Amino acid sequence: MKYILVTGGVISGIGKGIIASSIGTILKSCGLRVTAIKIDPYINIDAGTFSPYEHGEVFVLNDGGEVDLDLGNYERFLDINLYKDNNITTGKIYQHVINKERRGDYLGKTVQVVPHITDAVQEWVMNQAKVPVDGNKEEPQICVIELGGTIGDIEGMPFVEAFRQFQFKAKRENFCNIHVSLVPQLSATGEQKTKPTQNSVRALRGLGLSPDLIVCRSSTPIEMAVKEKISMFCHVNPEQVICIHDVSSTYRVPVLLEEQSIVKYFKERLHLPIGDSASNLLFKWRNMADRYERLQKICSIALVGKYTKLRDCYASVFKALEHSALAINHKLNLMYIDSIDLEKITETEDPVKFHEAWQKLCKADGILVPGGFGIRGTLGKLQAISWARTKKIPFLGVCLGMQLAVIEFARNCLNLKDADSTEFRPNAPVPLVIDMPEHNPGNLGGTMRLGIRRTVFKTENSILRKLYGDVPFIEERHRHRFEVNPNLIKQFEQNDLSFVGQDVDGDRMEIIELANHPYFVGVQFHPEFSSRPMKPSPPYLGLLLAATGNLNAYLQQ
Amino acid sequence: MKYILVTGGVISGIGKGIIASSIGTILKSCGLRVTAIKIDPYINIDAGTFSPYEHGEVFVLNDGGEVDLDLGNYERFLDINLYKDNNITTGKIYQHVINKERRGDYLGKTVQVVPHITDAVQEWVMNQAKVPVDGNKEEPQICVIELGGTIGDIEGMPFVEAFRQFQFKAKRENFCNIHVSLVPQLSATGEQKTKPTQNSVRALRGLGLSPDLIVCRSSTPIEMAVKEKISMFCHVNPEQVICIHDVSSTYRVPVLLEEQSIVKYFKERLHLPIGDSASNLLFKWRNMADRYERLQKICSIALVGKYTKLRDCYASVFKALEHSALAINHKLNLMYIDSIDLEKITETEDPVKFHEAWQKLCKADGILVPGGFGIRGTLGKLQAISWARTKKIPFLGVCLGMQLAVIEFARNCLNLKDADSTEFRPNAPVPLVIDMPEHNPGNLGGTMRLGIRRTVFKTENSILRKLYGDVPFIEERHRHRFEVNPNLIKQFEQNDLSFVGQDVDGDRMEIIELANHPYFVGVQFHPEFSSRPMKPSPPYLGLLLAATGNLNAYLQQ
Amino acid sequence: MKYILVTGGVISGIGKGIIASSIGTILKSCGLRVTAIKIDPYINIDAGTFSPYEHGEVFVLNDGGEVDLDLGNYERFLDINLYKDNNITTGKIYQHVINKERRGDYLGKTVQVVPHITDAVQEWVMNQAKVPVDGNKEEPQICVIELGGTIGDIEGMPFVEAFRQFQFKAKRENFCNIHVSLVPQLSATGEQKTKPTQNSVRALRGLGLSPDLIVCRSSTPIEMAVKEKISMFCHVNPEQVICIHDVSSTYRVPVLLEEQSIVKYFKERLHLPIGDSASNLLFKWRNMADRYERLQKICSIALVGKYTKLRDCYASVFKALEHSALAINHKLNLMYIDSIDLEKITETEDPVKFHEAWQKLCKADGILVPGGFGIRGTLGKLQAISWARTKKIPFLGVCLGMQLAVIEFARNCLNLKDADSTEFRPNAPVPLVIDMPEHNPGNLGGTMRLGIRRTVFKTENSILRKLYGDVPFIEERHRHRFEVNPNLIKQFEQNDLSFVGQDVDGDRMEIIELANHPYFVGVQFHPEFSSRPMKPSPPYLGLLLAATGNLNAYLQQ
Numbered sequence A, B, C: 001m002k003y004i005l006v007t008g009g010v011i012s013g014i015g016k017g018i019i020a021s022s023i024g025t026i027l028k029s030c031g032l033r034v035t036a037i038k039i040d041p042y043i044n045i046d047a048g049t050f051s052p053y054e055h056g057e058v059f060v061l062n063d064g065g066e067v068d069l070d071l072g073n074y075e076r077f078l079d080i081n082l083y084k085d086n087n088i089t090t091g092k093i094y095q096h097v098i099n100k101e102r103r104g105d106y107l108g109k110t111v112q113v114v115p116h117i118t119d120a121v122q123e124w125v126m127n128q129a130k131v132p133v134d135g136n137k138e139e140p141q142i143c144v145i146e147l148g149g150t151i152g153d154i155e156g157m158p159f160v161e162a163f164r165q166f167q168f169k170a171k172r173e174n175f176c177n178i179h180v181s182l183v184p185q186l187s188a189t190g191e192q193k194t195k196p197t198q199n200s201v202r203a204l205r206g207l208g209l210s211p212d213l214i215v216c217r218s219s220t221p222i223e224m225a226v227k228e229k230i231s232m233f234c235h236v237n238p239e240q241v242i243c244i245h246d247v248s249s250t251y252r253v254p255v256l257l258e259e260q261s262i263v264k265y266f267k268e269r270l271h272l273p274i275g276d277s278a279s280n281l282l283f284k285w286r287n288m289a290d291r292y293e294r295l296q297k298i299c300s301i302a303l304v305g306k307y308t309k310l311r312d313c314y315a316s317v318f319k320a321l322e323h324s325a326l327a328i329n330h331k332l333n334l335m336y337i338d339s340i341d342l343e344k345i346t347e348t349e350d351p352v353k354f355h356e357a358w359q360k361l362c363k364a365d366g367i368l369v370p371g372g373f374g375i376r377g378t379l380g381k382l383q384a385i386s387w388a389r390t391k392k393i394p395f396l397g398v399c400l401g402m403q404l405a406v407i408e409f410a411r412n413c414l415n416l417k418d419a420d421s422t423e424f425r426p427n428a429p430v431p432l433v434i435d436m437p438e439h440n441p442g443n444l445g446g447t448m449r450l451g452i453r454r455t456v457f458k459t460e461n462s463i464l465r466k467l468y469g470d471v472p473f474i475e476e477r478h479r480h481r482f483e484v485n486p487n488l489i490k491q492f493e494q495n496d497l498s499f500v501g502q503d504v505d506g507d508r509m510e511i512i513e514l515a516n517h518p519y520f521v522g523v524q525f526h527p528e529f530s531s532r533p534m535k536p537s538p539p540y541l542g543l544l545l546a547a548t549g550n551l552n553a554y555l556q557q
């Protein structure tokens, strides 16, 4: 199978992941079938033990992975559904080899980092390239590999040795190489320098790889004498020094690389069966990148969250949301409100943090409550859901918002004010949200409801059955532990809020739809991760179709 | 003698020379006596065979050096007068050792680049540190050394080996080390990274030097957690990671390093006799850097030249000129006019390049004609000097402008139109500007008039004797070959233009002063290189005192 | 033209020059025409200003070069006659570029070590590869290049950069690469390690070359799992890790590389027109390497010299001498006698150094007096030439021995005891050996008689005309300044010693032949450098044909 290894150059925050995924979008739209194996230098096996603030935004796969943020970038720029071993971290090999040396699967033999780690990386990438990562069951054709972290650092050393020997496991005509590099410049001088691109490739050749492409990233597009300079010091023709300047969007990055004629390069370098025509489906990525800059209308919806800033921590949500806003022709102004700032605590001790966050909630024409774990920042979002019910703003709750809306509906329309969850003050007077972990035969104890499960509708007049396309069942990614108590359906028999979503065996309720309000829905699943920039996530479309008035006319065609 | 070795880090155009000279200005203004030995990676022995366009601006010393542009930066930030061996280039050692291996001064012994080049660098810097580079004859106390070019390049390899062994020739407490480094950042992210500072110091330690200071250069001032990161990977305390951001002037660079507390560092690192008080003369550099930003008035003088742009090529002139403009409180708008664009050739073939350059000459209230060699761009400047004589704008001619003004005065007030030079159409009908090279006993042939020579005034009503301070003689740097013909003094006996300057033995005329015009003077010497930012060059002051009307009131006190 | 670049690996004294010349002997004996350009890291332009003790043995070319010892190794393993620019030293480029920057042949432009040195190396090797280095005037076909010194040292840095860019000036199929490496082992362990071969190639790839062959040099032949290890870490198939163990001779090194199948490798790597047959003339090198180990007879001749040991300093002579001893089937025991130890000084102050050196002279059956400059060690060799005349041992004088024999013949058969040279106590009572430098039109002053000149015989009964093949004239390399005085032919008209050799214009006498003694001849030229291992140098053959009695029977067929 053909292999494309991107690898970093001078510094860290270049944009490997937008380069590596945009090599995917080209060869996805050339007809070829693409996988993606993002290498990670960090140690976190089954990575989602993080704090989303740090790191950012634990991503969820179909099988139940707790996988890196930047693996979500492949499942949008392609329609790929990745697997939990289709990520690979440093502490995933070292756990895989320590588990093999204690079984005795090496027969003594004094296991080493060469070759017994570098074989374990190469056995990994020979296998996860083969698994059909599209829904179409067929062996794939290329494999973009993203070696995270820079080079010359001391986590590249187990991996660039592993891909040093991997040039010759495959043939020369099966293994390309991308080296994304920083080409800085100073302001008042204008000279666009490229010393560190020289000293990074010299560090790269000493590690055993030579760049086939050298993707220089700058502020302005690099001069034609600059790429003539890199051609002499980095052993490649000047047609292969691709620039990528300060792009105004991520959607322009695939159409920018195509005009740099990379499609013609991978035709001869990897001998791929592209063909020679209009070189991709330019009619999708450019046809929306023209729409992304042509945005002058505003659907400024709010997003109350547990965290102080958008150091990303909701990248996924943000992304789904735009995906809707690209299909409605609206520049989305995401007002990020901290949930702590709306509490009763804040107005006593610090009114400026209080009122400035509330003022954003008043001007907003959509509240989104995403997922989250813990008592922290909970009591603020309970004020915001009451602001959606008593002032008629479109609302969407995701995996905690569905839980907290059903809690506050009992507090404010049923006056069951003592009802709470069991995550929150666990010895519950009225146990409305209880714990109910899963029991799948094959593990021990209470497992999280995690992965693709089935969700069955109940009624016919569902505003989500209108959006998903009148289908009986949907499949979305779950990540939680808790449910609404089935012994509180008795208190929910006739009033405004009712249940629409339900799983297979019926013990757990999924989707709510409040009456006499254009949009008040809450989901147990995460609608984010099934979105693409082609098809929006259907709950996120209805949150923006109701945030601009088009929710009426959308449901008349 | 104490030694300070600055050395470059990530890229080329950082600003070694403004860092290395600002370490000079601190220790000049701490009471210590400073030298400067700029290393150069290039090969040009007796360097001024360049084209000023390329490179830029051949600088002139007292003894007759043809020395680098960036050695002029030391003779302004200090009152130092440098010597021609106080520069050192790669092709100056290799010529010095090839000349010694052919005499036999090594006694066979198979001379090598280690040690016989690295000794020749160390014998050089042990000697030129000792020579009193100030006018005060006394052995100096420190020696700033500027290793030009980056590190890890293959000209550092002869020199960083030469300073590797030079740590131990001197004691530990005689040899500091500065490593100026690039700390880039990307725009929309804000992360201020410092990977290449790590990999440059690792390259530096492998070459045998460890940084005592690490001067990180960025756009914004670097965060206090960023310099905490460099402290762990580059083996120095966090108080020694000095930042230098996008400075608005070069004069702020010395006062910016002082607030980073470098004076306290070199007190303990080098055991220098500074003292503890107001740590420098802050009352000079800050007291003009406040004046440099407080400039709202304009003295927009023109500068017609042979070259297409100010890729620097007149840095010296530019610099002298501001030095005057700092003392007059005027932001100098240097309009750079190309001499080719004012010719009769240009208006025929390309009127836009013609009129846009002339339009600058009409709005200007000062014409400066600097030095230059050749027929190219000569006929354009002859139109501009006629524009100074027939429209009464203050004028200054420097070393070709003095020659061309005396030529055009004969063409337009004496109607000796056939008179020209002997550089230009050499078989002269009327030889008004002839060749007259020097004959100093000790060389063979016609030497250039080059270096500090004596210039004696003739009259008493000189507008330059008013400016230099009524002195009988001045000493300025010469660099030319040609003179005005002494057999054309007969045609100059009584009219408007007369001669004021004269050398010792009287064969050669120096300085002219036209009557019935506030400022029309021309000099054979170069007034630029004797200027400081404290004392302006006195011809350049009179070109700006007449460009704002203050030439009257300056000569009444 | 095809190019083969050998380059050193771990340490210095590996044997580049025996590897690089043995690649020559293969492709010489495959039918191809070979040149040789030995790079040198040292600085000595026109290198023979050395002391032969240091360094060793200034070699002489046809045109008048004063060239490295190790360029003589190419003129024996091939019949090549090298040129003085067909060597290249570091101080030959730097002098070539400093001479071009002062003429102005770069037009300013700020000459640099990249590219203006690396172009000057590549312009050099593109030119001296083209010059026909064989006597057959025809453009050659390959070019062995010996980059002296190790790699990662800071003289490789100007040259491995120069051959980094030179991979792409030529095509991929015109530039091979040899990397000769050290594979050490420890005694009692037996493990044959190859860590430094890995870290040298990683240093080599970071410099920009990849090894096509990796010639590992050890004590024992390296194991077949060791070359399997280098194949994974140095990017070449295991058939290309050539071993070379502790060879018993230098003549086995060409036939050892052939059995490692290098001829089959350069057929596909460089696409050379070899053919497929008996892969070389194995019938020459193996057919004498079998003769070199089959030597049990002894022709132990003496060699009195100015130097304390054979740190080589007479490599050339030594080599010529064996070349004769291979054709006589005698293991040559070269007894090296110091000339100082035979003096009257030594027996007074130190009898052990005296008698042990004389005892060697008494047992010896041949005295050779080679060339040399100076009064030092002269009076000892005058005792040894008297030991050849008064005790009838075969003698040969070379370029000082011809001078000193004619001196001592006047002292001991003519009793002109006051006669001496003019090098020695220059105000000569009887000037028998005077100075007579050449006057070639094109230089100034007294030039050395240097290079190929013509030597014309005088008589018919010459024991050298018997040896050279009854030819009228011979051509041999000269390197001296002095002659025998033509005004002392009057004192030489009739006695035992007479003159046989003579130049063209007759002023200078060359070759002497003493009567009533089987072999007492002396030459002004150096017979050494025209020898091969196929044809011996004809004076050195007659010194060994008379040292074993076969001088009679050789001259009867």
Ligand SMILES: Nc1ccn([C@@H]2O[C@H](COP(=O)(O)OP(=O)(O)OP(=O)(O)O)[C@@H](O)[C@H]2O)c(=O)n1
Residues within 6 Å of the ligand: A192, A193, A194, A195, A196, A198, A229, A233, B011, B012, B013, B041, B042, B149, B150, B152, B153, B154, B155, C111, C112, C113, C114, C115
């Ligand atoms: N890879 C390199 C590049 C340059 N040099 C030497 O360093 C000098 C130029 O240094 P620098 O400005 O750092 O190289 P540039 O390529 O000009 O820098 P940039 O990458 O900003 O263009 C040249 O004379 C050259 O001899 C070197 O030894 N090795």
Ligand SMILES: Nc1ccn([C@@H]2O[C@H](COP(=O)(O)OP(=O)(O)OP(=O)(O)O)[C@@H](O)[C@H]2O)c(=O)n1
Residues within 6 Å of the ligand: A011, A012, A013, A041, A042, A149, A150, A152, A153, A154, A155, B192, B193, B194, B195, B196, B198, B229, B233
């Ligand atoms: N000198 C270093 C720095 C980092 N790392 C590894 O690389 C990862 C981080 O890489 P990078 O982002 O390049 O390092 P930072 O210092 O975070 O980058 P910056 O200089 O931009 O702060 C860390 O997990 C660390 O294990 C390393 O091996 N060697």
Ligand SMILES: Nc1ccn([C@@H]2O[C@H](COP(=O)(O)OP(=O)(O)OP(=O)(O)O)[C@@H](O)[C@H]2O)c(=O)n1
Residues within 6 Å of the ligand: B111, B112, B113, B114, B115, C011, C012, C013, C041, C042, C149, C150, C152, C153, C154, C155
């Ligand atoms: N660290 C070094 C050592 C030597 N050289 C250069 O390489 C030549 C000598 O090379 P080499 O023999 O490898 O160095 P030695 O120290 O003599 O080798 P050894 O370690 O065997 O003594 C010298 O002219 C010197 O200019 C260099 O650039 N860097």
Ligand SMILES: Nc1ncnc2c1ncn2[C@@H]1O[C@H](COP(=O)(O)OP(=O)(O)O)[C@@H](O)[C@H]1O
Residues within 6 Å of the ligand: A012, A013, A014, A015, A016, A017, A018, A019, A021, A022, A070, A072, A073, A074, A076, A077, A250, A312, A315
């Ligand atoms: N294919 C993609 N789709 C969507 N977002 C992306 C994609 N690639 C990168 N991004 C986002 O853009 C930012 C670019 O930084 P990134 O490429 O992650 O830096 P690095 O090169 O260190 O991985 C990231 O924070 C990431 O969240």
Ligand SMILES: Nc1ncnc2c1ncn2[C@@H]1O[C@H](COP(=O)(O)OP(=O)(O)O)[C@@H](O)[C@H]1O
Residues within 6 Å of the ligand: B012, B013, B014, B015, B016, B017, B018, B019, B021, B022, B070, B072, B073, B074, B076, B077, B250, B312, B315
């Ligand atoms: N001490 C100084 N005085 C005046 N001008 C200076 C001084 N130092 C630098 N400059 C000018 O400012 C610019 C800064 O670039 P420079 O420091 O020369 O880069 P580099 O670090 O590659 O030498 C130079 O072009 C130089 O002309």
Ligand SMILES: Nc1ncnc2c1ncn2[C@@H]1O[C@H](COP(=O)(O)OP(=O)(O)O)[C@@H](O)[C@H]1O
Residues within 6 Å of the ligand: C012, C013, C014, C015, C016, C017, C018, C019, C021, C022, C070, C072, C073, C074, C076, C077, C250, C312, C315
């Ligand atoms: N082709 C050759 N012919 C004759 N003698 C040689 C040849 N090559 C090397 N030698 C001799 O054998 C010795 C081997 O060392 P050498 O190859 O010179 O080490 P290095 O690899 O450092 O040049 C040298 O001293 C040299 O005199």
